[PDB]
Design a protein around this ligand. Structure first.
Ligand SMILES: [Cu+2]
Ligand SMILES: [Cu+2]
Ligand SMILES: [Cu+2]
Ligand SMILES: [Cu+2]
Ligand SMILES: [Cu+2]
Ligand SMILES: [Cu+2]
Ligand SMILES: [Cu+2]
Ligand SMILES: [Cu+2]
Ligand SMILES: [Cu+2]
Ligand SMILES: [Cu+2]
Ligand SMILES: [Cu+2]
Ligand SMILES: [Cu+2]
Ligand SMILES: [Cu+2]
Ligand SMILES: [Cu+2]
Ligand SMILES: [Cu+2]
Ligand SMILES: [Cu+2]
Ligand SMILES: [Cu+2]
Ligand SMILES: [Cu+2]
Ligand SMILES: [Cu+2]
Ligand SMILES: [Cu+2]
Ligand SMILES: [Cu+2]
Ligand SMILES: [Cu+2]
Ligand SMILES: [Cu+2]
Lengths: 172, 172, 172, 172
């Protein structure tokens, strides 16, 4: 045992390592979406940047679990970061649609980690999850849903002027 | 009853008083360690400062519990503040080890207190402990954790030179 | 073929992609080292922040290749990011030496990539490699070289006082 | 021989002269593009400025070859600047396609000149082209690529509203 460990079920230690991997997986996936929208035959730059930005955020979410792991005196165990499901993301609607899906999946991993922590009576982990992850997730989910709705209203995937307008007016 | 009290169980109220006392008693102990490292024949000024500081922090944690008790409409009942376990602390390795035991004891008590709030369904108490204590507790524990490990690497207890160096390099 | 591509050989494209992936591999390894030295029972914070830095820099080197790929009109294809080699890194010296190895390996793959660039006469790639990569590589290597030498002068692995001393005087 | 000349092959000197002229031919074609979009019946002022500016740039590239020729001890020999291919450029999409085509022609020339700098073992010329042209060229090529992609998505050449949106959103 670590000299610092207290109230940390080893089931939680191992879930954090799993969560840490999933975040990196999310990261990699967003950076694929970045490289896709920066292709000269795609060339939607602001969509590209939004995906880059989210990729940097997801990665930071992961640095933050390493830190937590150590703070509680768990041990970080790293796994292969599995490559994204596609190399080609179709267009803005399909990329936004896959992003929503990924986000909901990370949310579920998170909720499951919280529920684990409720069951093991770990109030520190419960709080860390609530304060630093859970709200961020539902903000990002509402953004992406809002994008999807607008993209559908612009007439994606078929309507290319729509996709253009979105990239010029909906992403800062 | 008090005109202000709502959803605050008697045990929660009595526990708060116990925790208030514990906090005070830890403050007192750290005061002892302060007085110990400032002795002309121990003379590690920075170690002494790091303990003066923690003695001030714990006193403030105790004040926050009095404010809490009156806010919820319970009553502050004070008990004797018990003298610390030793008048003399050995050396920085020995003191840090005693600090680590004390912080884990206090953490335990906050976990017991938290459990009691979950059992009595007092979210307001649960959130107080979560936002203001639980995290500052795990932080201080890691901190001392790290100090012990470095103190050992440095050849404590018997290497005078390592104790000198830790005092000049690991504490501000 | 891409409307933008001009003087960019298939072989180079695929080598840029493999170079990308090595850069992520290297960033992943350095974060493993950061997580190692931030452990409570290892506790060398500055050594840990140095590995954290490289991890961030190597990750940027990967992003730069992703932008290169796209600018040439080639195509980013991602692979898995193999977990690092160890979960645990012994001590500062053992970790440095493992860092020295890793930097030599990456440099070599950049030299392999420059070689290919020359044989394909592709001086835009030849120049990219020379301006943005080839010099940071030797600087990083000489610096790690310097650490390995001071580390050894100080008695590593056996001498704990010297490991400390290094953490506090050689890395900010 | 000029008293300053060293390592500068007479084939290099001649091709710098042919490069100079090409740079002016480009500049000149761009200014015709600008004059085309400034017309009251074409009236796309931002597209016009994008051209006016790239014109001013190609002209600065030529001035820079002039200076170079003299530093190495070569001798500027000027030739007619041949008028451009067209007197009207159709619409924004034709113009950008012509421009892409022009930039690849120019790029190709800069590469032939580089190739020649290698064959004739001239580092100073090799460095000049890399440092000062090649990267600019791939950058401008990439940009026009992106413009053509978006113009195609905006329904050009038949869609006027498309063309107007580009003038008002993609170009400064
Ligand atoms: Cu965040
Ligand atoms: Cu996340
Ligand atoms: Cu996310
Ligand atoms: Cu909670
Ligand atoms: Cu909770
Ligand atoms: Cu002082
Ligand atoms: Cu505090
Ligand atoms: Cu406390
Ligand atoms: Cu405390
Ligand atoms: Cu106070
Ligand atoms: Cu709670
Ligand atoms: Cu709660
Ligand atoms: Cu720091
Ligand atoms: Cu690198
Ligand atoms: Cu590096
Ligand atoms: Cu970056
Ligand atoms: Cu070169
Ligand atoms: Cu760098
Ligand atoms: Cu040019
Ligand atoms: Cu060269
Ligand atoms: Cu060259
Ligand atoms: Cu220029
Ligand atoms: Cu140009």
């Amino acid at each position: 045992v670590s000299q610092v460990r207290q109230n940390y079920h080893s089931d939680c230690e191992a879930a954090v390592n799993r969560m840490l991997n999933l975040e990196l997986y999310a990261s990699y996936t967003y950076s694929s979406m970045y490289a896709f929208f920066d292709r000269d035959d795609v060339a939607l730059h602001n969509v590209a940047e939004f995906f880059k930005e989210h990729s940097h955020e997801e990665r930071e979410h992961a640095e933050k679990f390493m830190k937590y792991q150590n703070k509680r005196g768990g041990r970080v165990v790293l796994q292969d970061i599995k490559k994204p499901e596609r190399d080609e993301w179709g267009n803005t609607l399909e990329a936004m649609q896959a992003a929503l899906q990924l986000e909901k999946t990370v949310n579920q991993a998170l909720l499951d980690l919280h529920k684990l922590a409720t069951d093991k009576v770990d109030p520190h982990l419960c709080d860390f999850l609530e304060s630093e992850y859970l709200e961020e997730q539902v903000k990002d989910i509402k953004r992406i849903g809002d994008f999807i709705t607008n993209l559908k209203r612009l007439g994606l995937p078929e309507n290319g002027m729509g996709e253009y307008l979105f990239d010029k007016h909906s992403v800062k």
